[PDB]
């Protein structure tokens, strides 16, 4: 089965995704953890380009999808055939919220591309780690990570609208402490996974 | 002004596009010559991936389009704004013929990606260097290069259908000799540039 972590930078997705991965493996599930973009050899190359080069937003959209395509074909689709629990650090909702809201690209066009790159694979549940931008920015500032407050505020809202509109999204209060946020994720998952 | 060479591998695109580059430059035009994929730094990185790594067809489609977004916004749109003659070695018809007619992906979906990546920029004329696969393959083997007969036959017919179904496309008989082929190209150009 498939579990997506979503939300803005600094909401704790890397942290919780890895905590869920270890937790679920200890309980006997065969589990996978992938990040987006990245997660394959080609995908990580694309990731380094996305994070390093100066790119217009259209080329950006195409490479995020190129990473996703390779991840879906090479690892996700097989993993799910073997009944692995696949954990994603970001998925299709990140693209809509960042490139749609955020960058201003057409939401329906982004969706068509998501569907193309995913072959229509969708999560059993998406965990939206929602957090106020000013709090996420303080968290990132401690590791010397700077992100754009005006940009991330639009993006937070997009995630919230998507959580109302798309299926199987649970809003998590990510401003809590690491153990409380993880307990709230466990309750959210209790609906679909033992 | 925008001039695009299209056609199967080994049809003389590289050769004639450079012939035309030197020709127009001697006659006083400011000219650019770009290849697809490639033509920019990021575009050349993706070209080396597309050529050397084992990719599924969907990831391929997205990378070909990503290289094209980069070339359009970084170079072609500025070039055209300065009234440069831009000569492309492969453009949007190559994606339709290879990824659509060749590998079976949806041509309307491809044409939507084309439009998104080009921002609606279309050539003034496209030169299809039509040639029988057998000849092309022979020329290619002489330079120690081998391509897939069964695949190119589909791609050639795709190019010919687009020459009818698309706009501003002239079919060049590229089986002739180099000066013979360039002579039909100049003829085709004279209804566009002088
Ligand atoms: N619940 C939490 N409370 C406070 N800080 C946290 C919490 N979870 C993670 N962090 C810290 O916040 C920073 C960003 O978290 P990370 O998991 O990398 O977020 P994301 O992957 O969503 O950007 C890291 O330095 C991390 O140690
Ligand atoms: N008119 C021609 N007749 C015979 N051989 C040619 C002709 N034009 C080019 N060639 C040779 O065929 C090979 C492929 O040409 P090239 O322009 O690289 O084709 P493409 O770019 O379409 O792959 C090159 O080695 C070139 O020297
Ligand atoms: C997967 C994805 C990530 N991103 C952003 C999110 C991050 O700011 C950045 C790198 O992601 P990360 O910090 O979570 O690893 O790429 C998008 O804008 N669109 C997308 O589709
Ligand atoms: C521009 C483009 C090229 N190709 C193929 C054509 C070539 O076989 C291959 C390398 O290009 P080249 O031989 O013309 O240099 O990339 C596609 O499949 N789709 C595309 O959109
Ligand atoms: F993340
Ligand atoms: F990450
Ligand atoms: F991160
Ligand atoms: Mg991360």
Curated annotation (Swiss-Prot), chains A, B:
SUPFAM superfamilies referenced in this protein's UniProt entry, alphabetically: P-loop containing nucleoside triphosphate hydrolases (SSF52540)
Classification via PANTHER family: THYMIDYLATE KINASE (PTHR10344), UMP-CMP KINASE 2, MITOCHONDRIAL (PTHR10344:SF4)
Gene Ontology terms: cellular component: cytoplasm; cytosol
Alphabetical list of CDD domains matching this protein: TMPK
GO terms classed as biological process: dTDP biosynthetic process; dTTP biosynthetic process; dUDP biosynthetic process
Listed GO MF terms: ATP binding; dTMP kinase activity
Pfam families: Thymidylate_kin
Protein name per its UniProtKB record: Thymidylate kinase
Protein's gene: tmk
Family from the record: Belongs to the thymidylate kinase family.
Keyword Iron: no
Transmembrane residue ranges: none
Positions contributing to ATP binding: 7-14
């Amino acid at each position: 089965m498939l579990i997506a972590f979503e939300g803005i930078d600094g909401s704790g997705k890397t942290t919780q995704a890895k905590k869920l991965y270890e937790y679920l493996k200890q309980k006997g599930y065969f589990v996978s953890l992938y990040r987006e973009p990245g997660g394959t050899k080609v995908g990580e190359v694309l990731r380094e380009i996305l994070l390093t080069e100066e790119l217009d937003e259209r080329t950006e959209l195409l490479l995020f999808e190129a990473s996703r395509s390779k991840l879906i074909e090479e690892k996700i689709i097989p993993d799910l055939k073997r009944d692995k629990v696949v954990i994603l650090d970001r998925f299709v909702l990140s693209t809509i919220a960042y490139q749609g809201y955020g960058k201003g690209l057409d939401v329906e066009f982004i969706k068509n591309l998501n569907e193309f790159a995913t072959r229509g694979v969708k999560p059993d549940i998406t965990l939206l780690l929602d957090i106020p931008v000013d709090i996420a920015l303080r968290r990132l500032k401690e590791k010397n990570r700077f992100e754009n407050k005006e940009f991330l505020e639009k993006v937070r809202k997009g995630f919230l609208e998507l959580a109302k509109e798309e299926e199987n999204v649970v809003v998590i209060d990510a401003s809590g402490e690491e153990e409380e946020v993880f307990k709230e994720i466990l309750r959210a998952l209790s609906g679909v996974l033992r």
